[model samples]
Target: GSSARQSTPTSQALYSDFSPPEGLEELLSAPPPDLVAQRHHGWNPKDCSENIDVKEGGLCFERRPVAQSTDGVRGKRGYSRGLHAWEISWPLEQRGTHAVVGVATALAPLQADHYAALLGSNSESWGWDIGRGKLYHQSKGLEAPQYPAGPQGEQLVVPERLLVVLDMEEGTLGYSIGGTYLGPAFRGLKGRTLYPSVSAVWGQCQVRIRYMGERRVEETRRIHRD
Candidate 1:
C-alpha cells in the first residue's frame, strides 16, 4: 500500500508544552501598573547625616536638595496577582554608591542607617545592587551571574537599563539588563501585594523608572492599587 498503518496522535507532533522556569512567568495575564517612586517612602528618618537627595518628585536633577543616607522609594501602586514589569535607568554621569532596585512588601522597612537598608534589609524586601553586583533578600546575599562588570574589571558597569518581571500568583521574581533576562532571581512570593522599589546612596546617583503597565499584559485585569 502507498501508506502503511495510520500514525497515532502521539506521532503527529501537533503540539509542545513550554514553561519559563519554576516560579517564573506563569500567569502574565494582567498588564503591569504604571509605577514611579513615592516621595514619602524613602529616606532614613533616624540618620539624616548622610541621605539621598530626591529631585523632580523622584526625578533626580543636577545640583542639590539632597539626602545622604540610604534612601528607597516604592511605587504608589501595588500588585497581588498576575505579571508585572518595570524599568530603571541610571544617569550617564552620576556620583555615589549603593544603587539597588527590587520589589518591596508593605512590611518592608522604609528607613534604615545604611544605603543597603533601603531594600533587602528585612524579610519583606528583595533587591539587586547595581553598585555591588549582588542580589539581596531577607538580609541575605543571592548569586547574580548576570551582573555586568566594568572595563577596568572592578565592579558592575552601570547598566543602561534594569528590568524586573514578577508573577504574584506563581511567587517568582526575575531581572534583566538591557532587555536580556538573567533567569529567576527569587521565588515563593505568592499571595501578597508588592510594590516596585529602588534605593540610592550619596546625593549624587540618579535612577529613573518607567512602570510597564497594563499594555504589555495579555489580560485586562484591574491592578491592585492597595
Candidate 2:
C-alpha cells in the first residue's frame, strides 16, 4: 500500500529564520498526505504538471518534468509534489542555499523579510510574491485586489506556490490546516536551511510528519531524497 503524510501544524516564523529568517514535526504525522491538498488543479494554474505517482525518496516536493504557461495558465507536462518533508534550496533568489527544514503551511515570516530584504533589486524573488490584496499582503496598497480564496473555496487561498519555513530560533508557529494542534509540537524553528540545526537544542532530531498539541512523528531522512 502507498503511504504519505498530512500537512502538519507549523509556525508563522518559518519564513523568517533564514535571512533574519521556517513545518510540522514532517507532513506524515497526522491525517496523512492523502488527506492533504492533492493539488489536482488551480483556478489560475501557472503551469502545473499532471499528478504522477509519488515516491518517498525524491528531491523537491513539487517537481515539474515539463511545464507550459498559456496566458498565465502554466502547468507541467509531468508535474508532481508531496507532503513528504525535505529541504530544497532556492538559489538565484537568495544569497545561498536555503534549507526548508519542513513543510507545514504556505505562510511564513520570510515572505515579508524577503520583500524587504532580497526582493526586487539585484536579487530575484522566488515563491509567489503574494503581492498586495492577499490576507498577508493586503495592507501594502501597492498591489491590486486578488482573490484570497480558490475558485470553489475548496483549498486554502495560498498566494504563493512554495512558502518558506520560519526559523525555529524565532519560534515556529503554525496550526493544523483543519484548525487544531496534534499536541504541543517541539515549537522549534522551520525556516531557510541557512541555520539548519535543531539537533543541538533538542539534543536529538528527526523529521516531524504530523503534529497536534505536543504529539507528532517523523523520520531521520534529513538529506534531500537521494
Candidate 3:
C-alpha cells in the first residue's frame, strides 16, 4: 500500500553555529586528482524533464519558456563514494522563483505540475533554494545561515557561483560561495549515489554545472591527519 504523503513542516538544526575543522579548507581548495586529464560532464538529457533544454554539450541547461510546471535535471555522472565537488552557476538576473541547486538520487522526480522546489520535495533528493537561502529535504525548508556574515547586521547577498561539496565518507553535503565555505547543510548521506541536480521555475533561465573532479576520502584524511 502506498503511504499518503503529507506536508509536515519540520526543522532540524544541523549546521547552526557550524565551524570548519582545521585543514578542511585547504582540502576543499585543493586541485582535482591528478589521475584524470580533464573532468567535464553535463546534464543527462535522458534523465531531465521535457521542460528543460540541455545545451553547451550538456554543461548548461535552460528551462523552456512559459512552462508552468517545475522542471529539474541531473548530471551525466553520479557519485556513490569519495569526496566530490562541483560548481553551479545561476546568475542573479537569470534566477526566478524557486531556483534550487543540490544533489539527488536516481529515483527523484524530474518534473511536477505545481511550481515548487521539486528536487528536494521527496526523500530521494536534497536541495538548497538559491534564491531564498533555504535547505530543502523531504518537503521541508529550513533557513540556512548566509555565508560571509554581513556588516552592521545587514543581509548579505548570495553570489552567482556556488561550490558544492559532497563527502560520502562523512555522509555530509555542504556549499561554498566566493571562496568561503559554509559548512554542511545536510548530512546522513553515506552510501547513496547522488547526482548534481537543479530545478528551476523560471522560463528561459539558464543554469550551468561544472564537474570539479574528486579525491578519495582516504587520501584526504591522510593529508589532514599528518
Candidate 4:
C-alpha cells in the first residue's frame, strides 16, 4: 500500500519537497470535512448541573432555572502534551453569555457556596473573563481590565466566538477572536494535563466549542476530474 500510494502522481507532487501548485496552501490549511470529536460534557455535582449541558459540547446555563452562582465544566480529555486549541462561541443568542473560559486542576472546587464558582476566582485555575475582559489566576488579577469598544481596547463582540490555543511544548496559552490573534495570554503551564474549561454566569447562557489542533494529514483523498 505504501509503495502504491507513493507511486501515484498527485501523491508524489504533494509529498515532494518542491513547491505545491496554485491554491494548495489554502486547501491544506482547511480542516477536512470529516473532522470528528467526542461530544464533551462539563463537570458534575449538585448545582453544577445548572451550568453544564450533558449531551452537547458546552455549558447550558438554563439547566437549573436559576442563575444563583457561577459554575463551570471541563473538557472530557485532559492534555499534557502537544499544541491544542479550542474555540468557544456565544451562539444564536447573546444574552446570559458573560462567562470565563480556561483550564483548571482537580483542586478547584466544582461546587462551592462561598465564591461565584467561576474559574480563576480561586487558586486551582486560570481564566479570562469574557464580560470583564480580565485575566485571572490563583484568585489574583494578571492583566488590566478591557473595555467594550472603549479606550481600554479590543472589543470582543458577542457571537464572534473566542479561540484558546494552548502550546504544551511551550507551556503557553494564546487567544484569537474574529480571526485576529491576540498573542499569549498565559505562560509556564509546566505540570499535569489541563482540560478545556468554562465558567457560566447567566442562567440561559450557551456556548459551543470545537478543538482545532491537528489539521494536516499525509493521506490525501484525491479529487478526480471526469
How many backbone clashes does every candidate have?
Answer: 12, 57, 0, 0
For model 2, how does the per-residue alpha-carbon lDDT over 69-117 read when each residue is reduced to its tens digit? Answer: 1111222121123222212122223222211222222233344573476
What tens-digit string does per-residue lDDT give for candidate 3 at 164-205?
675566655555654365433343344343565555434345
C-alpha RMSD values across all candidates: 24.3, 21.6, 17.6, 22.8
- Give lDDT per model, in order: 0.44, 0.26, 0.46, 0.45
Looking at model 3, residue 151 earns an lDDT score of 32
Q: Would you list the clashing residue pairs of candidate 4?
A: none
Candidate 2 segments whose C-alpha is farther than 4 A from its true place? 1-50, 58-66, 69-86, 90-226
State the lDDT at 130 in candidate 1.
Answer: 60
Candidate ordering by lDDT (highest first) = 3, 4, 1, 2
- lDDT of candidate 3 at residue 219, scale 0 to 100: 47
Q: Over the stretch 1-226, how does candidate 1's per-residue lDDT look in tens digits?
A: 3376875454546574533223211222233222112222222112221222343456652322323113333332344456666666666465444555555565544556246554444547544556454443323444344573344312243455666666655656555665454443343234333555555444455666555533334577856686
Model 4, C-alpha of 117: deviation from truth (Å): 28
Candidate 3 residue pairs in backbone clash: none
> Where's the lowest-lDDT run of ten residues in candidate 3?
32-41
